[PDB]
Design a protein around this ligand. Structure first.
Ligand SMILES: *[C@@H]1O[C@H](CO[C@@H]2O[C@@H](CO)[C@H](O)[C@@H](O)[C@@H]2O)[C@H](O[C@H]2O[C@@H](CO)[C@H](O[C@H]3O[C@H](CO[C@@H]4O[C@@H](CO)[C@H](O)[C@@H](O)[C@@H]4O)[C@H](O)[C@@H](O[C@@H]4O[C@H](CO)[C@@H](O)[C@H](O)[C@H]4O)[C@H]3O)[C@@H](O)[C@@H]2NC(C)=O)[C@@H](O[C@@H]2O[C@@H](CO)[C@@H](O)[C@H](O)[C@H]2O)[C@H]1NC(C)=O
Ligand SMILES: *[C@H]1O[C@H](CO[C@@H]2O[C@@H](CO)[C@H](O)[C@@H](O)[C@@H]2O)[C@H](O[C@H]2O[C@@H](CO)[C@@H](O[C@H]3O[C@H](CO[C@@H]4O[C@@H](CO)[C@H](O)[C@@H](O)[C@@H]4O)[C@H](O)[C@@H](O[C@@H]4O[C@H](CO)[C@@H](O)[C@H](O)[C@H]4O)[C@H]3O)[C@@H](O)[C@@H]2NC(C)=O)[C@@H](O[C@@H]2O[C@@H](CO)[C@@H](O)[C@H](O)[C@H]2O)[C@@H]1NC(C)=O
Ligand SMILES: *[C@@H]1O[C@H](CO)[C@@H](O[C@@H]2O[C@H](CO)[C@@H](O[C@@H]3O[C@H](CO[C@H]4O[C@H](CO)[C@@H](O)[C@H](O)[C@@H]4O)[C@@H](O)[C@H](O[C@@H]4O[C@H](CO)[C@@H](O)[C@H](O)[C@@H]4O)[C@@H]3O)[C@H](O)[C@H]2NC(C)=O)[C@H](O)[C@H]1NC(C)=O
Ligand SMILES: *[C@@H]1O[C@H](CO)[C@@H](O[C@@H]2O[C@H](CO)[C@@H](O[C@@H]3O[C@H](CO[C@H]4O[C@H](CO)[C@@H](O)[C@H](O)[C@@H]4O)[C@@H](O)[C@H](O[C@@H]4O[C@H](CO)[C@@H](O)[C@H](O)[C@H]4O)[C@@H]3O)[C@H](O)[C@H]2NC(C)=O)[C@H](O)[C@H]1NC(C)=O
Ligand SMILES: *C1O[C@H](CO)[C@@H](O[C@H]2O[C@H](CO)[C@@H](O)[C@H](O)[C@H]2NC(C)=O)[C@H](O)[C@@H]1NC(C)=O
Ligand SMILES: *[C@@H]1O[C@H](CO)[C@@H](O[C@H]2O[C@H](CO)[C@@H](O)[C@H](O)[C@H]2NC(C)=O)[C@H](O)[C@H]1NC(C)=O
Ligand SMILES: *[C@@H]1O[C@H](CO)[C@@H](O)[C@H](O)[C@H]1NC(C)=O
Ligand SMILES: *[C@@H]1O[C@H](CO)[C@@H](O)[C@H](O)[C@H]1NC(C)=O
Lengths: 428, 141, 141, 428
């Protein structure tokens, strides 16, 4: 009953731009049981997958999703199995709730050896992003067994407090994104560097105003922090964690290259078809999807797809499709999982609105073509962060997308899970 | 459903009787428009009027004043273009600050500049006082 | 003269034809009462009905709608205690806001709460619509 | 013709509680002439007394006492004289009327050296209390000679603009009360401080709820501003003004001790029997009389009387006699004057009504007893602010109360003066 990573040469998928409803999403949430009295909101979602195992995390709130009171933090893992239906489904095996739900933030997950490793920020001054200057820089790593042993002592659950942190010219450093990858015995977590704004080194003339009246050369630099006046700037990157660097191994921050540079955002690094891809959410003026093959890791350089079809809703300054350098900080995280490297086709769930968080559409796409798609709900269904991961089941490509979704007036708000087999035929 | 707000002196709904009150339902959308007015079509104003639109507490709406680091909805710098912003009274959003609407709380949208490229970054009652340029939001229970 | 206005469903002076209209004379006093209704005596209702009473411009009074930062007269929080509020139609008052009573103008004492603890802060027609709980005041020339 | 301050050991007064009509008030208003067509309303009344002199002010509105059109402002000084009758009476020697009636607010007077000094607020934005965030914070002094020279321009009437103001942590600062004191050549006006609400410093658990069901600990802190969402809170205190400090002296704000703290309100500091006494109007939930001996000045701290018999008409939330912390801003200024420190007996005019401004009764009292009293008028006569000053005329205690007062029907609404001799005998 084993799901496998997306590797080698899977079955054929339709490579034709079509309008036929070949895509037939399935709702499989149920196998991830979730309770909550009315007026409960479940958010800050995380889903990760590797080798037929998953990590998961959410923050359960009472009140609004934005400001509501943190009731509990779930951090769990389990396996991705065939539910007998020849359909992929998740199955929890190990969960862990942190003592104080208010202290943990921005968790990130990577799998290695019968273990998922969840690296979080620890903060008593709130979200480390929103109160940058007052955060300890304090990190923490949990390590859950994907197949819990009937009690061993440190196996099933284990914690490390993270002593040393090679962080270079960056003041503070933290995990910023759903999941990363392993390289043998090295873990790479999506992450972010906090660099004092004054020490930010930028030739304002590298800003792409060249077809943009109203955009001023200063815009790119200013849009590298949450406010123009902000104390730090954010630089996306990876946090390296060597498991063989002793009992107490160091984390090392690796900044992303200054190619097509946005303000540090929640990002993903993942293996598809024998080579890592890297996604970075678009949280300012560069609103077309930013992902593409990883050329090299330890000097971190990403070959950004020159996509012209996929975007996200912003607000007024930088809405969906905006390409001109404006000074802003807004957006959502709808990632995209590469499924065909020969033809560069990727699958994701995107929000078909300009300035609004609604209408989740599971879309399969190429750089300048959307081949096929599938509305997950209704036109005015509310949706936010979406997390897509792809794998194989009997050499057939499946995708599981976690989607922040509800339509106005349901009692408990919470993310749902969609399994979406990728079709071989282009027809019926 | 909800009527779009054309944010310029030509609007007229600003200095009317009730004084521009809206009763948004949970789920509704609201579009704020700063229309062209350079190649002038309808809804546009005598000249271009420079505004920043802030979403505000209500007590702050009264005082015609917006806090430091305000909730800036819409900046109106572009006389050439039509500019618009859209809110859906809902829990999810492309907004990264994590504000929220409360129950039985009045909020305001206001403009506190004087309508000029120079006095644009002003946070205390400008057109808010001068042209009664503030809208009241009373959102469904 | 003027009679005490009891503010519960038990009144029924509300469900009357014209609709509870008082014509106070300059010099007249007025009481609005929210009677115990815990140890249930006379004049109290089936159960305690949580209200906030506002004095309203009459135009707004018709629309059953309190303005922002309204003129709150009385707040029936306490089901244990009798509450009251007294006005005198006079120039002096322990009120510090500087409100004034135009003559030949209509004012309403309205309650926009649904009469529940959770509906209390409601600023737009509740029982004012439901049970028709408002009172017109036409004050001697 | 010889009135002096209340000092040393004067003639004896009745120390008994009694029902006998031993108090016989006299009307004396006419000696201080006032005019006005029908529908004219005279308000914002000031009355100061010191060393046989008096300061006076008022604002003439045409229309309502609240919102009628400001016709003119009066600031006047003169002397308190044995009118021949052996009865004290007010004689005007010097009147100044401001250019704009609309710009002058919240005047306060203290007398020094053949000169009354009148501190006022200058405002083009309405009552600074009601429009705090728009007020410039600008003050103005006026120096009126109690005995005008003949053809002595600057002697008679002089005015500083008020250059530097030491307001400390406070954003704005202004006079708030009828009258203060002098110590040598230093002047002390009653004043209030406008503090940004978010910088106010209050441990909510200091709100005395212990016997008050329905009272919440947040009540006191929220009642410190005119509304729970006022941008400022009001802290009462003093404005110190040294005359010997240049030709451009420095106003310095002294905040009041946090013992029995209430929302900053019109107050009065005054010399009685050779020691200063402070009174604060009760404009929220602390509705029993707030006054007592000033223990010290330049750190201002008042030894409030534990008085249990005097209060003032409020409205619904905080009516007369309310002692429980609520959220309210409401009341009237009804000051009292110490007349015997050995017994701590005081006199004032108080409105005999819970929630309505009417029934002005001149009353003499101790902390837990009313000794004796006299209704100045009818049970349903309208009355509002009352300012009472006491002194000596032939070593006999006399009080002069300025009472806002009218009864429905009469054409010009104006404040009136009452002289009341304090009875030595408890008898006929
Ligand atoms: C959702 O937001 C979108 C983004 O629109 C643009 O971005 C925002 C901020 O990013 C700015 O406000 C503006 O830059 C602009 O609005 C959708 O915008 C679409 O709007 C239209 C204009 O109304 C745009 O028209 C274009 O069409 C021609 C080709 O342009 C080029 O092609 C596109 C796509 O292939 C490419 O991205 C880019 O390289 C070029 O824009 C025209 O040549 C051109 O001018 C027009 O040509 C006329 C004839 O010569 C001439 O008379 C005038 O000069 C113009 O009319 C150009 O402006 C279009 O590019 C945008 N679409 C896309 C995919 O980007 C918008 O969705 C549209 O709104 C509706 C409602 O009215 C319809 O226009 C239409 O269904 C959609 O296009 C937003 N959605 C809603 C509901 O509000
Ligand atoms: C209007 O103002 C006053 C308001 O007083 C109170 O304040 C408001 C807000 O703070 C609040 O709603 C209530 O607390 C109350 O209205 C006059 O109200 C007075 O009348 C009653 C209450 O109705 C009295 O309350 C208590 O009296 C005694 C002792 O209480 C002590 O002692 C006093 C004085 O020493 C002191 O104030 C405190 O230490 C403390 O309150 C009672 O024992 C007590 O319970 C009563 O005892 C009997 C015997 O067992 C029981 O049957 C039952 O439990 C209960 O009746 C309290 O009830 C007064 O305290 C209060 N006045 C004063 C000076 O404090 C109100 O005048 C009253 O109105 C009339 C007509 O109805 C009569 O009630 C009475 O003649 C007046 O007191 C004023 N005018 C009007 C028209 O409202
Ligand atoms: C706190 O203090 C400030 C004063 O410093 C005050 O601000 C004023 O607010 C009022 C509204 O309450 C505002 O009134 C409007 O003014 C315009 C007049 O246009 C010009 O006049 C100003 C001086 O007279 C000038 O300074 C400006 O350049 C301005 O452009 C008027 O058109 C409005 O009238 C509206 O439409 C019709 C008129 O026919 C009326 O039915 C109705 O009156 C409508 O409002 C309106 O009158 C005034 O201009 C503000 N002044 C300034 C300098 O800010 C706050 O009101 C005060 N807050 C409190 C609680 O007291
Ligand atoms: C980023 O993170 C920092 C914290 O690191 C945060 O700063 C805090 O801000 C709040 C006020 O906004 C402070 O809380 C108030 O503190 C004062 C007294 O100070 C002391 O409070 C603690 C008591 O346990 C101490 O441990 C501290 O060391 C400190 O000395 C209180 O008077 C106050 O009560 C006031 O009144 C009512 C409640 O009665 C409230 O409505 C008000 O909020 C309040 O002012 C509060 O308890 C806190 O102490 C600050 N900490 C420091 C080191 O500055 C920033 O807000 C945050 N920025 C963002 C954008 O999130
Ligand atoms: C799409 O478009 C860019 C630029 O057009 C293209 O080239 C860039 O990427 C290379 C690999 O890192 C750089 O060596 C090269 O300098 C850079 N182009 C410049 C400086 O003009 C990318 O390849 C990008 N990717 C594809 C495959 O679509
Ligand atoms: C009445 O009120 C209080 C309590 O009975 C008395 O004590 C207070 O005043 C003292 C200064 O004179 C302070 O040192 C104390 O902190 C304070 N005591 C407390 C809060 O319990 C006060 O003397 C009395 N006032 C009068 C005039 O008798
Ligand atoms: C960056 O760009 C300019 C012009 O391209 C170049 O001369 C210089 O090296 C840099 N300018 C500054 C101000 O650093
Ligand atoms: C406020 O008061 C409580 C007890 O009343 C005390 O424990 C605390 O130290 C004070 N300061 C706070 C809450 O910061």
């Amino acid at each position: 009953e084993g799901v496998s990573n997306l590797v080698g040469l899977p079955n054929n998928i339709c490579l034709q731009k079509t309008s036929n409803q070949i895509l037939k999403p399935k709702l499989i949430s149920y196998t991830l049981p979730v309770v909550g009295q009315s007026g409960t909101c479940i958010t800050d979602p995380l889903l990760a997958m590797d080798e037929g195992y998953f990590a998961y995390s959410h923050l359960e709130r009472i009140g609004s999703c934005s400001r509501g009171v943190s009731k509990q933090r779930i951090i769990g893992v389990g396996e991705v199995l065939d539910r007998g239906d020849e359909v992929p489904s998740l199955f929890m095996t190990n969960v862990w709730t942190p003592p104080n739900p208010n202290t943990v933030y921005h968790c990130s997950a990577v799998y290695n050896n019968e273990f998922y490793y969840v690296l979080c920020a620890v903060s008593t001054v709130g979200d480390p992003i929103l109160n940058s200057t007052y955060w300890s820089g304090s990190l923490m790593m949990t390590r859950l067994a994907v197949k819990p042993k009937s009690n061993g002592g440190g196996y099933n659950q284990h914690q490390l407090a993270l002593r040393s942190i090679e962080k270079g010219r960056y003041d503070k450093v933290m995990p910023y994104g759903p999941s990363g990858i392993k390289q043998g015995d090295t873990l790479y977590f999506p992450a972010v560097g906090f660099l004092v704004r004054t020490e930010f080194k930028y030739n304002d003339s590298n800003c792409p105003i060249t077809k943009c009246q109203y955009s001023k050369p200063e815009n790119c630099r200013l849009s590298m922090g949450i406010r123009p006046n902000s104390h730090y700037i954010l630089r996306s990157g990876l946090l390296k964690y060597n498991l063989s660097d002793g009992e107490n191994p160091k984390v090392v921050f690796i900044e992303i290259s200054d190619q097509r540079l946005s303000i540090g955002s929640p990002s993903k690094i993942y293996d598809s078809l024998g080579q890592p891809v890297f996604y970075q959410a678009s949280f300012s003026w560069d609103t077309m999807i930013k992902f593409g093959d990883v050329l090299t890791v330890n000097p971190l350089v990403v070959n950004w797809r020159n996509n012209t079809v996929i975007s996200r809703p912003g607000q007024s300054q930088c809405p969906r499709f905006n390409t001109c350098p404006e000074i802003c900080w807004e957006g959502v995280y709808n990632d995209a999982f590469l499924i065909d490297r020969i033809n560069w086709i990727s699958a994701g769930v995107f929000l078909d609105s300009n300035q609004t968080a609604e209408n989740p559409v599971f879309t399969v796409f190429k750089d300048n073509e959307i081949l096929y798609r599938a509305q997950l709900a209704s036109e005015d269904t509310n949706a936010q962060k979406t997390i897509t991961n792809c794998f194989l089941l009997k050499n057939k490509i499946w995708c599981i997308s976690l989607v922040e979704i509800y339509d106005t007036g349901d009692n408990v708000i919470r993310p749902k899970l969609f399994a979406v087999k990728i079709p071989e035929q282009c027809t019926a | 459903s909800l009527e779009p707000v054309y944010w310029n002196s030509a609007n007229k709904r600003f200095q009317a009787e009730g004084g521009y009150v809206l009763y948004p339902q949970i789920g509704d959308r609201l579009d704020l428009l700063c229309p062209r007015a350079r190649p002038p079509g309808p809804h546009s104003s005598p000249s271009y009027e420079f505004y920043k639109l802030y979403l505000v507490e209500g007590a702050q709406g009264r005082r015609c004043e917006a806090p430091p680091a305000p909730n800036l909805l819409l900046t109106c710098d572009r006389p050439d273009l039509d500019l618009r912003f859209t809110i859906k009274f809902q829990e999810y959003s492309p907004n990264l600050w994590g504000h929220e609407f409360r129950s039985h709380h009045d909020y305001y949208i206001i403009a506190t500049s004087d309508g000029t490229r120079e006095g644009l970054e002003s946070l205390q009652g400008g057109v808010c006082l001068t042209r009664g340029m503030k809208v009241l939001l009373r959102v469904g229970q």
